[PDB]
RNA sequence: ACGACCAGGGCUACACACGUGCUACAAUGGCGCAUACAAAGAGAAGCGACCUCGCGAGAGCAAGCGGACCUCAUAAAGUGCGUCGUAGUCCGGAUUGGAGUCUGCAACUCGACUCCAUGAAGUCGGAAUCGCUAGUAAUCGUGGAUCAGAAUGCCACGGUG
């Protein structure tokens, strides 16, 4: 690849909330926290993911228990 | 890289039994991934295309090629040779790393994601999809983006038909609508 | 908003209908006038027809909609501009 | 005002008197910190079930003679016009024109 | 000096100077100074570098600057994407928190228009 | 049916123009801390002390009061001390994001209030035009009626002058 024309591309780590850590080469430069990946996305998994902190559904349950 | 090793280690065996290919050189393989942004508003502002190019460079890691109008078109007020687009061809390790990053991180990020279409195969096994918001990629920070844009992703394969193209992408757990 | 100590508010008839829709497939839209009821997680994926005062506007529930009222997704007034 | 509007206010007073105790018990359950959340939920739904007119907050003070929904004075139970008329006719004890 | 990527003014007393950081207002600034243990009537110029390093940690304890701006932008995008009332009002630049539109509403609308004619 | 009952919506719309207000544009001021002096009123499905909990709005417990007894209810401008230092600012507080609280079957349209963040316009207003001759104008706070809740309106009250 031509030298000095491409953005700095280096290996980084992406940690999903579920705790799945993936080693991906990328241009971000800083380690990045992730809220959802292919492993825990409901459509890919085929099952509703465990409610993660911050989600509107999660907030509704913590503040009030429906039963 | 990790996704390339998966293709040789797992995908070739699955396809060879499924389609009964006699030669390992007959299994479909991914050639290139082309990222395209049509900045048709570049006519009003040159900077808008530069910003799009910067976004494409952040998303893939390669300087984008600024595509120009093939012919003057009076309908869109474009004249032959005007820079109105950006494109990036990904091959090799960089292709396999973009593919991995896409399915693993960006695809599970589109709001109201019901699955990618499975009829978008072009008849020759080359898949094409269109991201309507670029903020799905982790390199695109929403704070410093001038305007939200979109990108066309084309995955060109050596597959002979649509069955063989769907199978190769399916073997990589591509999220088809099913 | 409504005090947390009180808990989220939902109409009883709508609550009944939604629970029946979870039990059966009930893809069919739920035609209701309860625009004051809060959106609960067990309604995600369902189509609720909320009244705008003249017509029931269909609304497909999503995850970001939980905790909001139904009436927030059925505009009641039609403004298309002044000179137009 | 209209006869229908007076009938409505009589029904509201009746339903609020008939259900005063039922509503009070549910509201105390709903506001009771100690009470179980399951009990609070049942009490909330039960209050929703009870008639709306049973709420005392749906009662508009109206002039007793006429039914006017505006200008009510609570001491007299009348609108400004009927209060003035009675004051001038001497039918309200102690009510005289005030200058200070 | 420079905290959270911005330079707090030297002449200003510490409490007012910290307010310059986005995401910091008199209440957070007063707390930061109580937690670090620095008197509010000290100028940033009087403050030593080591104290400034402590303040930077306290500022990190709170989302500020770009991380906050992004959060606000994303929330506004959430409302507009959802299609709620408050999202359509953000779309039309019309007041979102109830309010009247017949008159006033010029902070949201900006300067008046010549009746589009 | 131009009668009657109900559930939602509207009367709160918004290129715009006007009437009447409120709050400003600051240093005769802002803010912090300490501290002084009112009048007039309201209150039983009510006013609700003390104490405790919460940054707070508020909450829990609970006395008294049908009242010159108790409660709303600790007036504020003032004064003393510091700070700010003429800057769109330690001015201004509109707008908006996040989190609440209370009332009410129910606060989405469309309540008030709180907390954290944000920090518009505005640097004294053209032609014009309004009020006021003394405890008045100006300024500062207080109460009431309506009222579940919802005043910058209204009706009252005193402080300086
Ligand atoms: Mg009549
Ligand atoms: Mg009422
Ligand atoms: Mg009605
Ligand atoms: Mg009106
Ligand atoms: Mg200020
Ligand atoms: Mg008395
Ligand atoms: Mg200006
Ligand atoms: Zn995950």
Question: CB of A64 within 8 Å of any CB in chain D?
Answer: yes
Inter-chain touch A64–C63, beta carbons under 8 Å:
no
Nearest ligand, CA E16: 5
- What is the whole-number distance in angstroms between the Cα of residue D5 and the centre of ligand 4? 21
Q: Name which of C4, C67, C68, C69 to mutate to probe chain A: the one with the most chain A Cβ atoms within 10 A of its Cβ.
A: C67
In a domain, D53, yes or no: yes
- From the DSSP assignment, how many helices (H) and strands (E) are in chain E? 6, 2
Is E25 exposed, middle or buried (CB count within 10 Å of its CB: 0-12, 13-18, 19+)?
exposed
Distance between E98 CA and the closest CA of chain C, angstroms: 13
For residue B66, the enclosing domain spans: 3-172
According to the annotation, is A16 in a ligand binding site? yes
- Which whole-number Å values give the CA distances from B19 to B26, B120, B175, C63, in the listed order? 10, 21, 21, 41
How many CB contacts within 8 angstroms connect chain C with chain D? Answer: 15
Q: Is position D69 within any domain?
A: yes
> How many structural domains does chain B have?
1
Q: Specify if D95 maps to a domain.
A: no
Q: Is residue D51 domain-resident?
A: yes
CB C4 within 8 A of CB A64: yes
Q: Identify nearest nucleotide to residue D76 by CA to C1′ distance.
A: F145
Inter-chain contact D44–C7, Cβ cutoff 8 Å?
A: yes
Scan residues 5-44 of D and list those with Cβ closer than 8 Å to C: 30-31, 33, 37, 40-41, 44
Number of domains comprising chain C: 1
Q: Which positions on strand F lie below 7 Å from a protein C-beta? A: 3-19, 45, 59-60, 83-85, 90, 94-112, 115-120, 145-148, 157
In terms of Cα–Cα distance, which of B115, B105, B113, B165 is closest to B137? B105
Angstrom distance (rounded) from CA A26 to CA C36: 47
The phi-psi region of residue E80 (left if phi > 0; otherwise alpha if psi is between -120 and 50; otherwise beta) is: alpha
Q: What φ, ψ does residue B20 adopt, rounded to 5°?
A: 60, 40
Chains that touch E (3 or more CB pairs under 8 A): B, C
Breaks following residues of chain A (C-to-N distance > 2.5 Å): none
Chain C CB contacts of A63 below 8 Å: 4
Q: What whole-number distance in Å separates Cα of residue C17 and Cα of residue E48?
A: 66
* Tokens representing residue D4 in the block: 């229908």
Element spanning E63, H or E: none
CA of C77: nearest nucleotide by C1' is F13
Looking at B61-171, list the stretches that DSSP marks H as alpha helix, in order from N- to C-terminal side.
93-101, 162-171
Q: At B162, which CATH number?
A: 3.30.1440.10
Residue E102: other Cβ atoms inside 10 A:
5
Query: CA of D29: which chain C residue's CA is closest?
Result: C6
Give CA–CA dist C14/D93, Å, rounded: 55
Q: What are the beta bridge partners of residue B68?
A: B83
C71 is in which domain, residue-wise?
A: 2-82
Q: What's the Å distance between residue E106 CA and nucleotide F120 C1'?
A: 9
C55 touches chain B (CB under 8 A): no
The matching CATH number, chosen from 3.40.50.2000, 2.130.10.10, 3.40.190.10, 1.10.8.50, for E2-65 is: 1.10.8.50
D99 assigned to some structural domain = no
Contact A24, A15 (CB under 8 A): no
- Among C36, C67, C31, which Cα is nearest to C46's? C31
Q: Is residue D96 part of a domain?
A: no
- Strand A32-34 and strand B65-68: pairing? unpaired
Nearest to D12 by CA among D55, D66, D64, D47: D55
Closest CA to B57 of B68, B45, B65: B65
Q: Is the CB of A59 under 7 A from strand F?
A: yes
The residue assigned the tokens 């479909």 is: B28
Q: Which domain holds residue D70?
A: 1-90
Q: Cβ contacts of residue D44 below 8 Å, gap of 6+?
A: C6, C7, C9, D26, D30
The answer to the question of residue B128 being in a domain is yes
Q: Could you count the other beta carbons within 10 Å of the beta carbon of residue D63?
A: 21
- Which of E39, E31, E81, E80 is CA-nearest to residue E59? E31
DSSP, collapsed to helix, strand or coil, labels residue C44 as coil
Residues 6+ apart with CB under 8 A from B115: A43, B175, B176, B177, B178
For residue C8, give the nearest of C36, C29, C30, C28 by alpha carbon. C36
Angle between helices D37-49 and D20-31 (to 10 degrees): 150
β partners of residue B108: none
For tokens 């209060």, name the residue: D83
Q: Does residue B97 belong to any structural domain of this protein?
A: yes
Q: How many Å apart are CA B66 and CA B52, to the nearest integer?
A: 10
Q: Considering CB atoms only, which of C64, C72, C73 is closest to E78?
A: C64
Sheet of B83-90: strand order equals B65-68, B83-90, B30-38, B151-157, B127-131
Length, in residues, of chain A: 67
- Tell which phi-psi region holds residue B113, choosing left (phi > 0), alpha (psi between -120 and 50) or beta: beta
Residues of E in contact with C74 (CB under 8 A): none
How many domains does chain D divide into? Answer: 1
A55 to chain C: which residues are within 8 Å by CB?
63
What tokens appear for C35 in the block? Answer: 């625009």
């Amino acid at each position: 690849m031509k030298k000095d024309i491409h953005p700095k591309y280096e290996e980084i780590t992406a940690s999903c909330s579920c705790g799945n850590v993936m080693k991906i080469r990328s241009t971000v430069g800083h380690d990045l926290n992730l809220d959802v990946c292919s492993k825990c996305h409901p459509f890919f998994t085929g099952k509703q993911r465990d409610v993660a902190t911050g989600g509107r559904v999660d907030r509704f349950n913590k503040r009030f228990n429906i039963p | 890289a990790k996704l390339h090793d998966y293709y040789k280690d797992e995908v070739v065996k699955k396809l060879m039994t499924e389609f009964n290919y006699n030669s390992v050189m007959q299994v479909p393989r991914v050639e290139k991934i082309t990222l395209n942004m049509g900045v048709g508003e570049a006519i009003a502002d040159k900077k808008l295309l530069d910003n799009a190019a910067a976004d494409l460079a952040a998303i893939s890691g390669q300087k984008p090629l600024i595509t120009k109008a093939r012919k003057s078109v009076a309908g869109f007020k474009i004249r032959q040779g005007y820079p109105i687009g950006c494109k990036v061809t990904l091959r090799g390790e960089r292709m396999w790393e973009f593919f991995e990053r896409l399915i693993t991180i960006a695809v599970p990020r589109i709001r109201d994601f019901r699955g990618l279409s499975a009829k978008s195969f072009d008849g020759r096994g080359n898949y094409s999809m269109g991201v309507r918001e670029q903020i799905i990629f982790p390199e695109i920070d929403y704070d410093k983006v001038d305007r939200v844009r979109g990108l066309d992703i084309t995955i060109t394969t050596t597959a002979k038909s649509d069955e063989e193209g769907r199978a190769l992408l399916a073997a990589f757990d591509f999220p088809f609508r099913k | 908003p409504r005090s947390l100590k009180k808990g989220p508010f939902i109409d009883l008839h709508l609550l009944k209908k939604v629970e029946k829709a979870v039990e059966s497939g009930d893809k069919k839209p739920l035609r209701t006038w309860s625009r004051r009821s809060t959106i609960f997680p067990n309604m995600i994926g369902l189509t609720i027809a909320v009244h705008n005062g003249r017509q029931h506007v269909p609304v497909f529930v999503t995850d970001e909609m939980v905790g909001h009222k139904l009436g927030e997704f059925a505009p009641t007034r039609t403004y298309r501009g002044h000179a137009a | 005002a209209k006869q229908s509007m007076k009938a409505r206010e009589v029904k509201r007073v009746a339903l609020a008197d008939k259900y005063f105790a039922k509503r009070a018990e549910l509201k105390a359950i709903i506001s009771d910190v100690n009470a179980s959340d399951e009990d609070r939920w049942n009490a909330v739904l039960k209050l929703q079930t009870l008639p709306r007119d049973s709420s005392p907050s749906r009662q508009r003070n109206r002039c007793r003679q006429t039914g006017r929904p505006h200008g009510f004075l609570r001491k007299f139970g009348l609108s400004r016009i009927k209060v003035r008329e009675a004051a001038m006719r001497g039918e309200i004890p102690g009510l005289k024109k005030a200058s200070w | 000096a420079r905290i959270a990527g911005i330079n707090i003014p030297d002449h200003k007393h510490a409490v007012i100077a910290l307010t310059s950081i986005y995401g910091v207002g008199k209440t957070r600034s007063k707390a930061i100074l109580a937690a670090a243990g620095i008197a509010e009537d000290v100028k940033i110029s009087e403050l030593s570098e080591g104290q400034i390093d402590t303040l930077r940690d306290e500022v990190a304890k709170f989302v500020v600057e770009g991380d906050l701006r992004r959060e606000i932008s994303m929330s506004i995008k959430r409302l507009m994407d959802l299609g709620c009332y408050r999202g359509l009002r953000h779309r039309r630049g019309l007041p979102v928190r109830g309010q009247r539109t017949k008159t006033n509403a010029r902070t949201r609308k900006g300067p008046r228009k010549p009746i589009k004619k």
